[PDB]
Design a protein around this ligand. Structure first.
Ligand SMILES: CCCCCCCCCCCCCCCCCC(=O)OC[C@H](COP(=O)([O-])OCC(O)COP(=O)([O-])OC[C@@H](COC(=O)CCCCCCCCCCCCCCCCC)OC(=O)CCCCCCCCCCCCCCCCC)OC(=O)CCCCCCCCCCCCCCCCC
Ligand SMILES: CCCCCCCCCCCCCCCCCC(=O)OC[C@H](COP(=O)([O-])OCC[N+](C)(C)C)OC(=O)CCCCCCCCCCCCCCCCC
Ligand SMILES: CCCCCCCCCCCCCCCCCC(=O)OC[C@H](COP(=O)(O)OCCN)OC(=O)CCCCCCCCCCCCCCCCC
Ligand SMILES: CCCCCCCCCCCCCCCCCC(=O)OC[C@H](COP(=O)(O)OCCN)OC(=O)CCCCCCCCCCCCCCCCC
Ligand SMILES: *C(=O)CCCCCCCCCCCCC
Lengths: 65, 79, 62, 177, 128, 558, 171, 87, 155, 49, 76, 122
């Protein structure tokens, strides 16, 4: 039996469409939290970005004259 | 062939935003004649719709649950 | 007659196109030109039998 | 302005049309339903403030600057109904609205596929052709000298007759073929 | 007060903001009634032929025939060569021809001078 | 070798077989749309094997199988180029088209010309895979004009409607203005390089290649709806929903971007072409995203979305990152086809209602449609580790860290915020809140065709960026070192767009009525660009086509 | 097949299959399924067709044109000899066109076959292509649509006057 | 999709709208109740009722017809004309 | 059709104007021709240049797509003012205001891209360094000549 | 069927195969693949100056 | 129930033309395709060979396909 | 990103321009500076068909990673550490580019303070 059209009220819902929609919403947040738990660097950062001012003049070769 | 329409005596605008609209209209002497026509949008199964942060977080409860299940499964599997 | 789709639409065209490419296209010069496969240090060549030597030892960083 | 029956718009019609267009463009401005319903009663109050204006020249001027108010406050893309002109589904099925006379051009092998339909269509056409000369001689004695003044047509007066100029209005295609 | 709407060639003034739409005078009643009368008479003359069963063909529209005869036939026998017609037939008639003539002649003289001086890169140019 | 080229040609011949079936018909069909959908599913399965054996070794080839013409130095052969671009585009296009046709078996079920519709949609697919596999400019021009003409025939599907014919002729006009530049490029390569083949173009490697690249940029402007030649892509929403889903979001409109990605060894040695592509792409991705902020038709909003994503593709070509642009094409196809499918599911459920101001309350009425629309919007905006994260964010991670036009970067970031703005605008006016549609609810989505068709592109929109970006080889070096305010750029700008548009949406519940601002009138009437030029440029043509051309000169004087 | 000198193919170097992971790839199974289901029946039908080719062996020949006198040693306005010269010149024109097409096929196949190292590894084919295009341009460019042996001879004579004047002005 | 409209359905829906209107009492409302003369409404109220019909059934009634619909039976007959009911 | 319903020369006398306005089926007061400069319009009525998009859509038309009636004297450019073509309809924003906003927006975006091309943004790095004499043999260098040494050093 | 099996319409195929002779004749004998002069420059008398 | 008649123009003459078009094309299409298949299978493609000493070939003996040899011999 | 403000709003005399630098010798300030060693042979990255943008001073990690990517089919997640090695050494190459940039900026500061010392003294 199909979904009957209704008037000025909430339409009929199937159990299957609701559990599939909740299942794919859970799949979205599962995959987001999973790849955020394992990678954590594609969003935040892979390697440290060094400070240029914190480098010494000997490794860069600046003789003071 | 007949679609049996519901009652027109159950669409009352108390407890709705039409209540607020009729109060603010009667505050300056105005009266709202099409409110009970609008009353079905704000009651029943269409009442209490989620916000945007609640529409985003659909499934996040069970998704975080299965996430913690899989993290516990790999942590008890790695040893 | 349950899977006649994979016979009429796939398998007989694979026969036709394999006959066409095997006996009419590749029998003519430069029609199917293929990029030569990617050779790495450590590989073994099938046409010759020659083992490619590895790279230089690494000045390790970590 | 441009109408089939009247040659103009009465001031009452102009007021009602401006009120309707103001409410429609307002609903376009004011998407939510309770919010539009609040502003709709406010705008109804603004229109009923000068409902009882006797002076037609003063009401003409008030209507004119009301048109200026409506033009200053209009929405750029107002809500047009889908099958309303300017809508997204407007005149969509006009490519499916085949005129009825094309059934006359069918081959008899496919006319015989629907025997009751064309067997009834024969007496529909019979009805039309024995109604035509009676409704022509109806229209020729009621139309004034110089042609008809207005585009409206008289109805069927005698019992047994049909209203004049009726075949394309009755046998028009459905809006969803 | 409010910004007045500016009409244009491609942006006409609305029916609502035109003042002459709000004429109430009896001569406007006469003009509107005569327009309604001509339109109703032409509508009746059309749909007596349109709803006729004995006619099976084309209800010929002499306004359409008159429009096509104006767009095709009436162009030459109502021409008078004067200052306006001759100057406008000399502007858009021999103007852009001279324009593209000097543009293409200039570019081809430049290209020929570069080729006979060995300048133009005509290396792999063997299709022509 | 004998597997790769064979199944490559079997895919295209298999796509052409239902055209012979529909042309050799006498009976009334035993579900010809199911036959075409089954055929395109099997063509997807067939094209999967050359893609997998490309991911195994990197195996590219050319099939110059049929000699067609020899104009004295130009041997035009039927030549198919199976490279990385074909091996990643053909399974994505066949997968998306398979979902679009299972969608169309539900959506286009009331149409009595359904066999003509599936025929035209298959003809589009054939011309598009002629385009993306062509090895010379002539076969690419065949596929190019083919997708232009099938665009005409699928915009003007309801040919009785005046607006559909108008939009179709508009799209043909702007595409032929792009074809001016495409034929300019063909003319330049034939005269200066004696070839239309890609291999001789790439091997000769010309240096004075400003003029053919300007021709190719004009071609991509006409084809991918870049600024100046853009408005036909919003006009082209007058066609049916699976037309706008397949053709004008994900498959046809990437072909100007694909034309510029295809010619990457010329663009990587021409900085001027890169700068012009960067400026034009930033202009388009600003303008169309700004126009999307104040629209109310949902098909118009998602068309401005896909044109802003095409402008971003033009941006990331313009920073000399073509493979990231093509990864963004393959990524963008999934969620943008799914967003058009979910919008049209709302449209067909709400009885041809497309205006978002008469929607709402569909979070619990259409749950699967709401789920997939939220997932498509979040993949569009750059939610972390959806498919749209695996390309678009990297685009920003190369748009910041490169020798770049600074204003193009700033407009790229403003576009990145605007994507979040119109995405949560769609979710606000269409899914959230209280209902605004009329009273006779016929809301329903429980057809396995609709649910499975959105489901497979949902699996794509969740997993396909991860799968593809871990299956494609490196062709550039990914710039992975940047400061933390520069790494967190795209995410923070996207969340700022969400916050700003949520404040905008919560200013609409207030009981205030403001007069319209000039920014609202500008963005709502589409930068005033389709209002002026669609009136002025025809006028100055047609009077000049009548007064001086016909009447004055060629009937009287001459 | 064809002649491996005019269409040169360098010796192929494929690497050996080196399976590192334990998961079986689909490509070997699909290759065996293609070898059984597709290669064998096509090969059997081709053997049947080739037996039927052997049941009637007959040959065709490549037509040869012996060299007639060219336009230089034909008298002026003597159409019987300069017709022969023109036919010879046109056959050589079409053959020179196909020589250019062969060198283009070489260059395109070299570029694809070398892949990304095409600029390093196809210098000789690009050099041959530059020489044959310079030769074809010096021989047949700018003649027009009504080209003939006389136009080609006059272009050769103008080029030889230019080369002689360039030799003279260098000394 | 697209459910068929009936004169019982169009009648019951038009009367269902007019019974949710605070200037029309639900006990005097009939199928032939004239808006100006029998229910005592304004032309402004009549325009609001035709706009409520437009809100109800999802299409537009033009103004040359909206200025003349003066009973619920005329509304049901006009929607019967513009929707082709009882095939 | 016959001759006395066909167009003719320019109306000079008012009775020829009345005969034409009866011929063109319209009022004599509305009937104005194109001005007799010799451009060959003849006695055709100068309609006031309204696009057919502007018309009443809900009106019962004889030609619904054209929004045109039978016997109505058409516009001279009726092929031009169809709804598939040139429109003259009123717009919410003024015409010159649209042209000013469009020109200012387009020219200002062009000027800002010129400013950003004048001042380009980059990274605090040196140039990318490649081995083997800036990859001389890879970038198409000839094997017989030897370039200058391109040597990069550790840092 | 007639046009498809035309016997080498305007001797194109021959001209390829002939080229496949001549290149093979002058790759092997070390000659250039095409001379810059269509005719022999020894049998040509230029106008002197 | 309540099936509705769809007014449409006569699709008999267009379908009759297309049936006749396909029939009168296939009427000599199918014998020509079967005959070309039988020639390519049984009569088969000729082989390139050097011109022998003293053997002057006919003009139709310079072509590969048998139908091309038939055309060059019979008509040309 | 602050150096863009230092070069545009400040002076471009002390900020090293991106297009042509180093403007200083490589031995200037470095006693016995050594070259950059290339690990992968020219013929080895020739046969590996690497992109000309990818044949930098650390392409040998890329060759090992691509050999792992070919050999681990279909398990496309089995060579994360080889990609990590290549990305980390590209990161170190970018750090060396940053060190060259900071060297050039500090030697231009040396030149600026040198001419200011000369204008103060002489
Ligand atoms: C088929 C009937 C259809 C219905 C009838 C009506 C048809 C239409 C009427 C037409 C009337 C005539 C019109 C004029 C044309 C005349 C013919 C002609 O000029 O032919 C030209 C041309 C030249 O042929 P030729 O000069 O006669 O011979 C060439 C050889 O030198 C010499 O030949 P060969 O000796 O090398 O080859 C001999 C060949 C015979 O020759 C022919 O077939 C040639 C004649 C066919 C011409 C057909 C033309 C009609 C139109 C065809 C296309 C449309 C068809 C309908 C739609 C299809 C779907 C789209 O032998 C075979 O076919 C046998 C092998 C079969 C292999 C397949 C099966 C193998 C496994 C079997 C297993 C079972 C048994 C196991 C046990 C065995 C025990 C012993 O022939 C063809 O083109 C043949 C058609 C097939 C070509 C390849 C098709 C695939 C290509 C794919 C890649 C390229 C396209 C990419 C597209 C991308 C998407 C857009
Ligand atoms: C169900 C249908 C299939 C047929 C079933 C029955 C037959 C069984 C299958 C076996 C078939 C027979 C054997 C194989 C076919 C013959 C092979 C062969 O050598 O044929 C000779 C030739 C091969 O070419 P060629 O190189 O030998 O000669 C070309 C001719 N000259 C040199 C004069 C220029 O022809 C074909 O193969 C014809 C088929 C081509 C397939 C593609 C057609 C596309 C048409 C598009 C038109 C417009 C093109 C525009 C684009 C151009 C490029 C930019
Ligand atoms: C991705 C990570 C998302 C979570 C981190 C960002 C959180 C944040 O700043 O959210 C801002 C905002 C919530 O704050 P606000 O709406 O002002 O307050 C009401 C709270 N329900 O708004 C939101 O949380 C809604 C927008 C979230 C965007 C997610 C996709 C990016
Ligand atoms: C990367 C480089 C970028 C360079 C950018 C600058 C160069 C390009 C400049 C812009 C050119 C295109 C814009 C102008 C013409 C647009 C015409 C058009 O699209 O008309 C559409 C119009 C209907 O539009 P619309 O009003 O939306 O309709 C729906 C409701 N009526 O439809 C109609 O009115 C129908 C009209 C039919 C007849 C058309 C007549 C005009 C033809 C214009 C040809 C232009 C050729 C340009 C050639 C350039 C060569 C270099
Ligand atoms: C100097 O600022 C280097 C960074 C690149 C140029 C400036 C980019 C500014 C915009 C991006 C960061 C925005 C953070 C909210």
């Amino acid at each position: 039996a199909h979904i009957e059209p209704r008037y000025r009220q909430f339409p009929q819902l199937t159990r299957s469409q609701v559990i599939q929609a909740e299942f794919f919403s859970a799949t979205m947040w599962f995959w987001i939290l999973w790849r955020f738990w394992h990678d954590s660097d594609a969003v935040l950062g892979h390697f440290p970005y060094p400070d240029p001012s914190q480098w010494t003049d000997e490794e860069l070769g600046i003789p003071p004259d | 062939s007949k679609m049996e329409l519901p009652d027109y005596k159950q669409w009352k605008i108390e407890g709705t935003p039409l209540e607020t609209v009729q109060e603010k209209l009667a505050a300056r002497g105005l009266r709202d004649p099409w409110g009970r026509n609008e009353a079905w949008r704000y009651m029943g199964g269409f009442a209490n719709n989620v916000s945007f942060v609640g529409a985003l977080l659909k499934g996040f409860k069970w998704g975080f649950a299965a996430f913690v299940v899989a993290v516990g499964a790999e942590y008890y599997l790695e040893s | 007659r349950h899977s006649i789709f994979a016979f009429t639409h796939v398998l007989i065209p694979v026969w036709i196109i394999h006959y066409y490419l095997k006996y009419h296209v590749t029998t003519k010069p430069y029609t199917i030109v293929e990029k030569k496969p990617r050779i790495f240090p450590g590989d073994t060549i099938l046409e010759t039998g020659e083992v490619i030597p590895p790279m230089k030892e690494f000045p390790d960083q970590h | 302005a441009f109408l089939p029956s009247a040659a103009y718009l009465t001031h009452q019609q102009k007021v009602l049309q401006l009120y309707k267009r103001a409410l429609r463009h307002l609903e376009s401005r004011c998407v939510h339903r309770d919010k539009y319903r609040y502003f709709a009663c406010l705008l109804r109050a603004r229109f009923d403030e000068h409902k009882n204006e006797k002076d037609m020249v003063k009401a003409t001027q008030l209507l004119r600057e009301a048109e200026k108010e409506f033009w200053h406050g209009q929405h750029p893309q107002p809500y047009i109904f889908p099958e309303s002109p300017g809508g997204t589904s407007y005149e969509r099925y006009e490519c499916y609205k085949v005129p009825e006379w094309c059934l006359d051009d069918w081959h008899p092998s496919e006319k015989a596929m629907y025997p009751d339909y064309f067997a009834k269509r024969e007496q529909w056409k019979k009805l039309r052709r024995e109604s035509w000369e009676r409704e022509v001689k109806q229209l020729q004695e009621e139309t004034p000298v110089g042609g008809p003044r207005t585009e409206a047509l008289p109805p069927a007066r005698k019992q047994g007759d049909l209203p004049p100029l009726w075949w394309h209005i009755v046998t028009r295609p459905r809006e969803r073929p | 007060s409010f910004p007045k709407y500016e009409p244009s060639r491609l942006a006409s003034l609305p029916t609502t903001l035109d003042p002459a739409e709000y004429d109430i005078s009896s001569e406007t009643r006469k003009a509107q009634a005569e327009r309604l009368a001509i339109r109703s008479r032409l509508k009746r003359e059309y749909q007596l032929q349109y709803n006729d069963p004995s006619r099976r063909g084309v209800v010929e529209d002499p306004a359409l025939i008159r429009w096509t005869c104006a767009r095709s036939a009436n162009v030459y026998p109502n021409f008078r060569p004067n200052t306006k017609t001759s100057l406008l037939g000399a502007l858009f008639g021999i103007g852009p021809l001279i324009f593209w003539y000097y543009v293409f002649k200039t570019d081809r003289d430049r290209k020929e001078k570069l080729i006979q001086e060995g300048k133009l890169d005509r290396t792999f140019n063997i299709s022509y | 070798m004998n597997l790769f080229s064979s199944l490559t040609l079997v895919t295209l011949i298999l796509l052409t077989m239902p055209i012979a079936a529909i042309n050799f018909n006498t009976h009334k069909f035993t579900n010809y749309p199911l036959y075409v959908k089954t055929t395109i599913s099997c063509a997807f399965i067939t094209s999967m094997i050359p893609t997998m054996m490309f991911i195994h070794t990197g195996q590219e080839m050319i099939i110059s199988n049929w000699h067609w013409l020899t104009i004295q130095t130009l041997k035009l052969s039927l030549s198919f180029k199976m490279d990385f671009f074909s091996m990643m585009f053909v399974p994505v296009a066949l997968f998306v088209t398979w979902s679009i046709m299972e969608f169309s078996m539900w959506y286009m079920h009331s149409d009595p010309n359904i066999n003509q519709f599936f025929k035209y949609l298959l003809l589009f697919l054939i011309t598009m895979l002629i385009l993306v596999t062509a090895n010379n400019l002539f076969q690419l021009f065949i596929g190019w004009e083919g997708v232009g003409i099938m665009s005409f025939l699928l915009i003007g599907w309801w040919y009785g409607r005046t607006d559909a014919n108008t939009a179709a002729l508009q799209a043909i006009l702007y595409n032929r203005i792009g074809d001016i530049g495409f034929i300019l490029a063909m003319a330049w390569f034939l005269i200066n390089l004696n070839t239309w083949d890609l291999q001789q173009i790439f091997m000769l490697n010309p240096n004075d290649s400003n003029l053919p690249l300007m021709g190719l940029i004009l071609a991509a402007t006409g084809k991918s709806a870049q600024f100046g030649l853009h408005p036909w892509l919003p006009s082209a929403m007058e066609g049916p929903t699976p037309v706008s889903a397949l053709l004008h979001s994900s498959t046809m409109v990437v072909a100007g971007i694909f034309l510029l990605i295809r010619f990457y060894p010329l663009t990587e040695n021409n900085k001027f072409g890169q700068s012009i592509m960067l400026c034009l792409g930033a202009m388009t991705t600003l303008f169309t995203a700004m126009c999307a902020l104040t629209q109310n038709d949902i098909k118009k909003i998602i068309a401005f979305s896909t044109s802003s994503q095409l402008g971003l593709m033009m941006v990331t070509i313009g920073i000399n990152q073509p493979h990231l642009a093509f990864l963004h094409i393959c990524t963008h196809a999934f969620f943008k086809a799914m967003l058009f499918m979910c919008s049209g599911s709302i449209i067909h459920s709400l009885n041809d209602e497309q205006d978002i101001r008469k929607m709402g309350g569909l979070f619990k009425a259409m749950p699967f449609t709401t789920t997939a629309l939220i997932i498509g919007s979040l993949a569009l905006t750059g939610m972390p580790f959806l498919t749209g994260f695996y390309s678009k964010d990297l685009i920003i991670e190369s748009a910041n860290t490169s020798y770049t036009n600074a204003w193009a970067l700033l407009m790229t970031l403003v576009a990145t915020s605007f994507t979040a703005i119109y995405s949560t605008r769609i979710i606000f006016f269409a899914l959230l809140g209280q209902p605004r549609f009329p009273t006779l609810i016929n809301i329903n989505e429980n057809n396995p065709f609709l649910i499975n068709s959105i489901k497979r592109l949902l699996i794509g929109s969740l997993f396909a960026g991860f799968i593809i970006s871990n299956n494609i080889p490196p062709m550039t070096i990914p710039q992975m070192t940047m400061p933390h305010y520069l790494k967190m750029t795209a995410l923070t700008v996207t969340i700022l767009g969400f916050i700003l548009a949520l404040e905008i949406s919560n200013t609409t519940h207030y009981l205030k009525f403001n007069y319209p601002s000039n920014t609202f009138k500008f963005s709502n009437l589409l930068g005033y660009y389709p209002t002026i030029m669609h009136r002025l440029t025809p006028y100055m043509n047609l009077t000049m086509s009548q007064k001086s051309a016909s009447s004055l000169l060629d009937l009287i004087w001459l | 097949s064809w002649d491996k000198d005019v269409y040169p193919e360098p010796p192929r170097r494929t690497p050996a299959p080196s399976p590192q992971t334990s998961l079986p790839n689909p490509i070997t199974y699909l290759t065996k399924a293609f070898d059984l289901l597709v290669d064998r029946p096509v090969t059997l039908v081709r053997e049947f067709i080739e037996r039927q080719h052997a049941k009637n062996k007959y040959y065709y020949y490549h037509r040869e044109f012996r060299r007639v006198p060219d336009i230089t040693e034909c008298h002026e306005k003597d159409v019987l000899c300069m017709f022969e010269a023109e036919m010879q010149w046109k056959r050589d024109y079409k053959v020179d066109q196909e020589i250019v097409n062969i060198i283009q096929e070489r260059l395109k196949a070299c570029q694809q076959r070398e892949g990304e190292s095409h600029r390093q590894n196809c210098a000789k084919e690009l050099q041959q292509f530059t020489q044959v295009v310079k030769a074809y341009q010096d021989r047949y460019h700018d003649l027009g649509a009504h080209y003939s042996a006389r136009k080609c001879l006059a272009k050769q004579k103008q080029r030889m006057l230019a080369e002689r004047k360039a030799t003279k002005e260098a000394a | 999709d697209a459910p068929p409209l009936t004169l019982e359905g169009i009648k019951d829906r038009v009367l269902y709208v007019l019974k949710l209107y605070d200037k029309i009492d639900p006990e005097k409302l009939s199928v032939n109740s004239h808006f100006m003369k029998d229910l005592g409404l304004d032309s402004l109220d009549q325009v609001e009722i035709i706009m409520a019909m437009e809100d109800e059934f999802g299409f537009e009634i033009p103004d040359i017809d909206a200025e003349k619909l003066m009973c619920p039976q005329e509304i049901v007959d006009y929607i019967a004309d513009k929707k082709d009911v009882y095939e | 059709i016959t001759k006395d319903m066909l167009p003719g020369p320019y109306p000079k006398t008012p009775e020829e104007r009345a005969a034409a306005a009866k011929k063109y089926n319209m009022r004599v007061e509305d009937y104005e021709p194109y001005p007799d400069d010799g451009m060959g319009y003849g006695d055709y009525p100068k309609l006031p240049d309204r696009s057919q998009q502007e018309r009443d859509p809900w009106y019962d038309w004889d030609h619904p797509d054209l929004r045109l009636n039978w016997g109505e004297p058409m516009h001279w450019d009726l092929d031009m003012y169809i709804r598939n073509r040139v429109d003259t309809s009123p717009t919410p924003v003024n015409w010159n205001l649209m042209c000013k906003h469009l020109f200012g927006f387009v020219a200002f975006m062009l000027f800002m891209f010129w400013v950003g091309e004048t001042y380009p943004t980059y990274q605090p790095v040196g140039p990318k360094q490649y081995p083997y004499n800036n990859l001389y043999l890879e970038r198409g260098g000839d094997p017989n000549k030897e370039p200058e040494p391109v040597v990069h050093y550790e840092i | 069927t007639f046009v498809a099996y035309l016997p080498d319409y305007r001797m194109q195929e021959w001209a390829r195969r002939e080229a496949e002779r001549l290149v093979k004749y002058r790759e092997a004998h070390g000659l250039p693949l095409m001379e810059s002069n269509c005719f022999d420059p020894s049998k040509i008398q230029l106008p002197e100056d | 129930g309540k099936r509705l008649f769809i007014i449409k123009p006569s699709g008999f003459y267009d379908k009759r033309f297309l049936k006749l078009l396909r029939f009168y094309i296939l009427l000599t299409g199918i014998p020509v395709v079967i005959g070309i298949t039988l020639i390519n299978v049984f009569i088969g493609e000729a082989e390139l060979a050097e011109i022998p000493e003293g053997y002057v070939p006919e003009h139709w003996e310079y072509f590969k396909h048998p139908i091309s040899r038939w055309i060059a011999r019979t008509f040309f | 990103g602050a150096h863009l403000a230092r070069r545009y709003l400040g002076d471009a005399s002390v900020e090293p321009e991106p297009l042509r630098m180093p403007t200083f010798p490589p031995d200037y300030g470095f006693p016995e500076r050594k070259e950059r060693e290339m690990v992968a042979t020219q013929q080895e990255m020739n046969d590996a068909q690497l992109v000309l943008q990818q044949r930098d001073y650390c392409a040998h990690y890329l060759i090992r990673f691509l050999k792992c990517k070919r050999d681990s089919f279909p398990n496309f997640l089995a060579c994360k550490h080889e990609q990590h090695d290549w990305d980390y050494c590209e990161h170190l190459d970018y750090v060396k580019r940053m060190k060259e940039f900071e060297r050039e900026r500090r030697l231009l500061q040396r030149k600026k303070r040198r001419e200011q010392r000369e204008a103060d003294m002489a």
